Ligand binder design. Structure first.
Ligand SMILES: [Cs+]
Ligand SMILES: [Cs+]
Ligand SMILES: [Cs+]
Ligand SMILES: [Cs+]
Lengths: 205, 209
């Protein structure tokens, strides 16, 4: 499917180069493709893009360290979700936003959460940005898009914080693999799969 | 003007109830405009439209009774005078969904939560549908979109549960009134303001006899 885009390891390398250039990455894993960007570089336009063509449940993948720094509890005590998704309580920047919902507000909230020296008070809760706490050990622990996001950010030289959202078709169905490729090509995003990244990590372990 | 486009305040209300019953949506404005549909009749297609044109944070407005029935805690504890945002912990249907994100899945989750006899175990947590618990008293208590939604469903004759989402423009800004009007027209939706509803309910409230 992506072979035309290079071997698995080239795909990973290509994704890291895209991230370093501030572009997004379409990470594939029933296909689910997530658009991901580094939290440090994501722009208002990229956020608008993600709301318009994504599920609109735009998530901020963070480490357990960061979660604890922000004093953010996990959303539920007893996670009964099918995949054990690491949602914490939701967040909104305590300053610089109005309703929290616009692309510029969401990006404001992301930036507040990821800032060096960010404190709990910098964020009100609940809000319209959804932090996901990535499992320690990344994709080698849990082959989820959350873990893929953090691993790609750290491999690319960024802070371990990234933004993801599932690509959705206008008709409400989730974008199929070829549809993800089309979108990636159209928006200058690299394409990689979670399996590619797991393989890359295992080879470099 | 709202008057030119949708009628006087009471007409707007009445037209919104009719739209609801007929299976069309309603735009509720405060500017923040939310597209709303009865949770018991909303279709997959309406859900898709809601996700395509809204924030994608698609919420299910419920009553306190329903929240207690589902055993859904509030997302963040409250111990003040303030009402709060209304968010409970998020949900996914325990059955009949895969990732919970698609329009079809979201609808399945909604239907599971509002079913007669629904039980806590019919829902996993967390999930991709965001319940909002309405303040008892509706808009007369709190003039929010959540309360407006429930009041409209109640007035229209449905179960007190509705789905809402904020209308967003493609560039990521929130739609102002004029864009809301334009969207309602394009999509055959009715349009009403929260103030209209407050007024309407007051006029039929505490009437003698
Ligand atoms: Cs930045
Ligand atoms: Cs959207
Ligand atoms: Cs970097
Ligand atoms: Cs969307």
């Amino acid at each position: 499917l992506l072979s035309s885009f290079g071997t698995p390891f080239e795909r990973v390398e290509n994704a890291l180069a895209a991230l370093r250039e501030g572009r997004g990455v379409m990470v594939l894993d029933e296909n689910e493709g997530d658009m991901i960007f580094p939290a440090e570089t994501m722009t208002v336009e990229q956020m608008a893009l993600t709301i318009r063509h994504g599920s609109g449940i735009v998530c901020l993948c963070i480490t357990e360290d960061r979660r604890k720094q922000l004093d953010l509890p996990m959303m539920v005590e007893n996670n009964t979700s099918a995949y054990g998704t690491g949602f914490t309580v939701t967040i909104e920047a305590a300053e610089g936003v109005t309703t929290g919902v616009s692309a510029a507000d969401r990006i404001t909230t992301v930036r507040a959460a990821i800032a060096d020296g960010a404190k709990p008070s910098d964020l009100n809760r609940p809000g319209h940005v959804f932090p996901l706490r990535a499992q320690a050990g990344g994709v080698l622990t849990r082959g989820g898009h959350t873990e893929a996001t953090i691993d790609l950010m750290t491999l690319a030289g960024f802070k371990p914080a990234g933004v993801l959202c599932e690509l959705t078709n206008d008709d409400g169905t989730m974008a199929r693999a070829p549809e993800c490729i089309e979108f990636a090509n159209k928006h200058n995003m690299a394409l990689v799969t979670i399996e590619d990244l797991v393989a890359y990590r295992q080879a470099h372990e």
